[PDB]
C-alpha cells in the first residue's frame, strides 16, 4: 500500500477581455481556465496498523511563459501522518476553510468564472490575505463518521511585523461539515492577522456552502462575509453570494452556470457576475473547454475578471466587462 | 501508446577564452558545450483514432552553480494535440523558424562553435529579441508528405508596452521545407515587434538552410538576414552566413568544422569564425567532447565566443578571440 506519484496538469487557453483599467481590450494566451496548471510529487507510505506517512509537493505551472518567474512548491508542501484518527499535515497548503469551501465553486476556483470571495478585499499587506493558503500551517482533518467531518488549522505568524502588526500571517480556522455523497454542506470560520496601510487588522471570514448532486444536474452555492477590522477602528466588509448549477451533456460534455454578487460595503457598491462554461472530455485526462463571463460593476466597484496570463486587473468604476477563455486541460 | 517521460542532459565543461572585454583571459567551469543541459517532463496520451494529446515541460540546467538563479520551464512548456492533421502546440517554445533552421547548425546551437545569427543584434528591449523562443505562442506543424513540410506560429503581445511600442513580443512566422532523410532544406520568414531605445521597431528575419548527409560526411549551411527596422526610420541590418561539415571518425567519434561570417551593416564591420569540434561517445547517452574556436572581429565589431558559465561577453573592437571547451555530456 505504498506508492510515489509524479503528476500534473497543463491547462492553457486563448483568452479575451473587452476592457482593462484603461478601457482597452486585451487578448492573448493564458492559463488555468478549467483547472489550475500544476506539477507535483506525492507519496503514501504504509507504516502498519492503519498508520500512513505522506508527503505532497506541488507548484503552479504557467505554460504561456515557461514559469519565467521560477518554479516553486507554493500550492502545497506538506508532510503528514494519517490513520483511523484522521490526518495531521505540516507545511504550506490550503487552509481548511478554503480547502473545503472552494469545493462548492463549479469553476474549480480558477479561470474567469469562479467565486471571488476568497480575495484581498482590503489591500491587506500579508502574504495570503486572500484567505486561500498559509505558510507555517498545521492542520488536522477528522475522518468522516456518518457523514460528519471537520477540519482545523493553525498557522504561525513567527513575529512577522508590518507597522503596528507583530503577528502578520497568523491563521486560526476550521470547518464543520456533512458529506454523504450527493449532499454536502459546510460552515467555515477563520481569522487571520494582517495590516492595512501599516495598521494592525484582523481578517475575519465566515463561509457557508452547500450542494446537492441530483445526477442529472448539481446545484451548489456559497455565502461569505469577509471583514477586515482595523484595531484602531474601521472596517472593510464584503458580503459575497454565489449560486450555480452544472449538468452532464451527452456523455463526455458538461455545462456549468454560475451567478455571483459581491456587496462591497466600504465603497457602498455591488458587482454581479454571470458565467457560462462548457467542458468537452476527449478522455479522462484531456478536455477542451470554454468559459464566457459577464461582470457588471455598479457605482465605485472596479472588479475585473481573472483571465490568468492575459489580464486579471481591474476595470474603470461602474464598468461592465466581458471575458472569454477557450483552451485545453491535460492531466498527467 | 501512452507514456510519461522524465528526462534531461547534464553537460558540463572546463572552458577558456584568451580575452574578455578588458583583454584578460578567463577560464572556469561552464556548461552546455555539446548540448544544452536540461531537465524535463513530457508525455503522449493516445486518445483513439490517431489523435494524441501531449505535454512538454523543459528547463535549462546550470551544473556549475546549481541553477542558482532558480529553475524554470523556459525552454518549452507546451500542451498539444496531434494527429493525421499534424500538430498544434500552445505555450512557450522555440518559434517554428528557429526550431527548424537551427537544425542546420552542426554545434546544436550551443557552446562556442555555433551559428550566431539568432541573436539580439540591435539591443532590442523585448524578452526574446534573439528570435529563438516566444511567450504566448501557438504553433502548427504539418505532417511530412512526400518530403514537404511546414510550420507556422503566432505569439500574442498582450499589449506589452515599452516606449512607443505597444505590441512588444508579437511573433508571426513560419517555414516551408523539404526533408527526405539525407537531404534537408528550409526557408523561414518571421517578424517580431520590439523597441530599441524606447522606439517601436520591427525585427524582420529571413533564413535559408540546407544540408546533405552523404553518410561518410554531412555538409550543412545557413544564410540569414536580420533587420531591426525602426518605425520612425533607421535600421540595424545583419547578414549571417555559415557553412559546415561533420563526419564520423572510427565508430564512436565525430569531427565537426564550421565557418561563419557576420556582416554587421550598422557598424560597417565583419566578424569571421572557425570552429573545430570532436565528440567521443562512451555510450549512446554519454560523450566526451572538445571545441576549439577562433573569432576574428574587424573594425568596430566586438563579438565574443559563447563560453556559457565562464565568459560570454564581448571583446574590444577589432580583436580576435580564441576559445576552448572540454567536457562531458550525459543524457538521461
Amino acid at each position: 500500500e505504498s506508492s510515489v506519484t509524479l503528476f500534473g496538469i497543463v491547462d492553457t487557453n486563448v483568452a479575451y477581455v473587452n476592457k482593462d483599467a484603461a478601457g482597452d481590450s486585451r487578448y492573448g494566451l493564458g492559463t488555468s481556465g478549467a483547472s489550475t496548471s500544476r506539477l507535483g510529487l506525492r507519496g503514501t507510505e504504509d507504516l502498519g496498523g492503519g498508520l500512513k506517512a505522506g508527503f505532497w509537493l506541488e507548484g503552479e505551472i504557467f505554460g504561456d511563459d515557461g514559469n519565467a518567474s521560477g518554479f516553486n512548491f507554493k500550492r502545497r508542501s506538506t508532510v503528514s501522518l494519517s490513520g483511523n484518527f484522521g490526518e495531521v499535515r505540516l507545511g504550506r497548503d490550503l487552509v481548511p476553510t478554503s480547502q473545503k469551501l472552494t469545493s462548492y465553486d463549479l469553476f474549480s476556483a480558477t479561470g474567469i468564472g469562479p467565486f471571488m470571495g476568497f480575495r484581498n478585499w482590503a489591500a491587506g499587506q500579508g502574504a495570503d490575505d486572500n484567505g486561500i493558503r498559509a505558510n507555517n500551517l498545521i492542520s488536522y482533518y477528522t475522518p468522516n463518521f456518518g457523514g460528519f467531518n471537520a477540519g482545523f488549522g493553525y498557522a504561525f505568524d513567527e513575529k512577522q511585523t508590518i507597522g503596528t502588526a507583530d503577528s502578520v500571517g497568523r491563521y486560526i480556522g476550521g470547518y464543520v461539515a456533512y458529506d454523504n455523497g450527493p449532499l454536502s454542506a459546510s460552515l467555515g470560520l477563520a481569522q487571520q492577522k494582517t495590516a492595512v496601510g501599516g495598521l494592525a487588522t484582523d481578517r475575519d471570514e465566515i463561509t457557508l456552502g452547500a450542494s446537492y448532486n441530483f445526477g442529472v444536474a448539481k446545484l451548489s452555492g456559497l455565502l461569505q462575509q469577509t471583514k477586515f477590522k482595523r484595531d484602531i477602528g474601521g472596517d472593510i466588509k464584503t458580503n459575497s453570494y454565489m449560486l450555480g448549477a452544472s449538468a452532464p451533456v451527452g456523455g463526455v460534455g458538461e455545462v456549468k452556470l454560475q451567478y455571483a454578487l459581491y456587496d462591497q460595503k466600504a465603497i457602498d457598491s455591488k458587482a454581479h457576475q454571470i458565467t457560462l462554461g462548457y467542458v468537452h472530455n476527449l478522455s479522462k485526462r484531456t478536455a477542451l473547454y470554454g468559459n464566457l463571463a459577464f461582470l457588471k460593476n455598479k457605482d465605485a466597484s472596479t472588479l475585473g475578471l481573472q483571465a490568468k496570463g492575459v489580464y486579471a486587473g481591474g476595470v474603470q468604476a461602474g464598468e461592465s466587462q466581458t471575458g472569454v477563455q477557450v483552451g485545453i486541460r491535460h492531466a498527467f | 501508446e501512452s507514456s510519461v517521460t522524465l528526462f534531461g542532459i547534464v553537460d558540463t565543461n572546463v572552458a577558456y577564452v584568451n580575452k574578455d572585454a578588458a583583454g584578460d583571459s578567463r577560464y572556469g567551469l561552464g556548461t552546455s558545450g555539446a548540448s544544452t543541459s536540461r531537465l524535463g517532463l513530457r508525455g503522449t496520451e493516445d486518445l483513439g483514432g490517431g489523435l494524441k494529446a501531449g505535454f512538454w515541460l523543459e528547463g535549462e540546467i546550470f551544473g556549475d552553480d546549481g541553477n542558482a538563479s532558480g529553475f524554470n520551464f523556459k525552454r518549452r512548456s507546451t500542451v498539444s494535440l496531434s494527429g493525421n492533421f499534424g500538430e498544434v502546440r500552445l505555450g512557450r517554445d522555440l518559434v517554428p523558424t528557429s526550431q527548424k533552421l537551427t537544425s542546420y547548425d552542426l554545434f546544436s546551437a550551443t557552446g562556442i562553435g555555433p551559428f550566431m545569427g539568432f541573436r539580439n543584434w540591435a539591443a532590442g528591449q523585448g524578452a526574446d529579441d534573439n528570435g529563438i523562443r516566444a511567450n504566448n505562442l501557438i504553433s502548427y506543424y504539418t505532417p511530412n508528405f512526400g518530403g514537404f513540410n511546414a510550420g507556422f506560429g503566432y505569439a500574442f503581445d498582450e499589449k506589452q508596452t515599452i516606449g512607443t511600442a505597444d505590441s512588444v513580443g508579437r511573433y508571426i512566422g513560419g517555414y516551408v521545407a523539404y526533408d527526405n532523410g539525407p537531404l534537408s532544406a528550409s526557408l523561414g520568414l518571421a517578424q517580431q515587434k520590439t523597441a530599441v531605445g524606447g522606439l517601436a521597431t520591427d525585427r524582420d528575419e529571413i533564413t535559408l538552410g540546407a544540408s546533405y548527409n552523404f553518410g561518410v560526411a554531412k555538409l550543412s549551411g545557413l544564410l540569414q538576414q536580420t533587420k531591426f527596422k525602426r518605425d520612425i526610420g533607421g535600421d540595424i541590418k545583419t547578414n549571417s552566413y555559415m557553412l559546415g561539415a561533420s563526419a564520423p571518425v572510427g565508430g564512436v567519434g565525430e569531427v565537426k568544422l564550421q565557418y561563419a561570417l557576420y556582416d554587421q551593416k550598422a557598424i560597417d564591420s565583419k566578424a569571421h569564425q572557425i570552429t573545430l569540434g570532436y565528440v567521443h561517445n562512451l555510450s549512446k547517452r554519454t560523450a566526451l567532447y572538445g571545441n576549439l574556436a577562433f573569432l576574428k572581429n574587424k573594425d568596430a565589431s566586438t563579438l565574443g565566443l559563447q563560453a556559457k558559465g565562464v565568459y560570454a561577453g564581448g571583446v574590444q573592437a577589432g580583436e580576435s578571440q580564441t576559445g576552448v571547451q572540454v567536457g562531458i555530456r550525459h543524457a538521461f
Partner: peptide, 8 residues
C-alpha cells in the same frame, strides 16, 4: 517503488 503518473 517506481514513480507512477497521476492516474496510476
Amino acid at each position: 517503488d517506481n514513480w507512477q503518473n497521476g492516474t496510476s
